[PDB]
Amino acid sequence: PQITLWQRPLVTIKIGGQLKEALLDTGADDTVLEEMNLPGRWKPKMIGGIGGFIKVRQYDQILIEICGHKAIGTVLVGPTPVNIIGRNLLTQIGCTLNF
Amino acid sequence: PQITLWQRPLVTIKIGGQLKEALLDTGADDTVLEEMNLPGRWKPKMIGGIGGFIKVRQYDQILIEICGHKAIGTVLVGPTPVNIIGRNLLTQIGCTLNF
Numbered sequence: 587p588q589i590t591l592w593q594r595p596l597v598t599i600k601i602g603g604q605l606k607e608a609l610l611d612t613g614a615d616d617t618v619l620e621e622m623n624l625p626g627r628w629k630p631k632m633i634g635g636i637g638g639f640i641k642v643r644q645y646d647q648i649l650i651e652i653c654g655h656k657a658i659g660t661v662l663v664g665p666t667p668v669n670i671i672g673r674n675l676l677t678q679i680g681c682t683l684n685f
Numbered sequence: 686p687q688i689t690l691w692q693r694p695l696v697t698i699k700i701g702g703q704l705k706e707a708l709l710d711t712g713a714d715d716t717v718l719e720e721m722n723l724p725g726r727w728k729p730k731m732i733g734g735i736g737g738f739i740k741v742r743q744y745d746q747i748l749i750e751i752c753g754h755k756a757i758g759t760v761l762v763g764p765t766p767v768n769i770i771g772r773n774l775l776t777q778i779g780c781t782l783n784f
């Protein structure tokens with residue numbers, strides 16, 4: 587769909603059998619979700635944002651359905667205030683910026 | 686123009702006579718730029734990001750040219766690692782997210 591930016595670009599996602607709302611974030615290279623019950627192995631990683639860095643658990647090959655569209659990619663899970671869908675998954679659902 | 690998201694969405698901006706590159710960021714409510722010379726009065730403010738909070742100076746009614754489109758709005762200046770154009774100015778240049 588076309589999303590104007592007068593309010594935050596929030597979308598419903600289904601990940602690990604759970605329903606969540608997440609921000610479509612063109613400034614984010616990675617997808618990072620708040621702490622959740624997600625199965626399997628993960629590697630430690632660190633990401634830096636405004637205000638500093640956070641330690642996240644990195645899961646690969648995770649299925650996410652973002653507004654009905656399936657995608658599989660890396661998901662970082664950790665102490666973010668907001669669920670973020672970043673550019674690694676936005677390219678997969680064919681999302682563009684237009685002006 | 687239409688911008689796909691395989692690379693960071695960076696654009697040239699002109700602000701206070703100086704030329705800079707900035708990220709088009711739909712996850713950012715506000716525009717925050719690295720420390721720069723900027724004329725005027727300002728109010729201290731704090732913004733929260735992924736690793737925590739930073740103190741910024743808020744400048745109102747600042748002219749910014751973003752890819753040859755002029756906009757006037759609030760600009761926050763402070764210790765961000767990247768120049769961020771957030772939704773307060775993205776709606777002014779008519780930017781939409783599409784998928």
Ligand SMILES: COc1cc(CN2C(=O)N(Cc3ccc(O)c(OC)c3)N(Cc3ccccc3)C[C@@H](O)[C@H]2Cc2ccccc2)ccc1O
Pocket residue numbers: 611613614615616617618633634635636637667668670672710711712713714715716717732733734735736766767769771
């Ligand atoms: C509430 O408004 C604002 C919020 C921010 C902070 N914020 C961040 O901390 N991240 C960091 C980041 C997240 C995920 C990544 O995958 C990443 O990699 C580049 C960086 N970036 C900006 C950034 C990019 C590169 C380097 C440093 C910073 C994406 C933003 O939308 C936003 C995400 C966010 C929104 C709301 C709450 C928490 C985080 C900035 C400006 C604002 O006006």
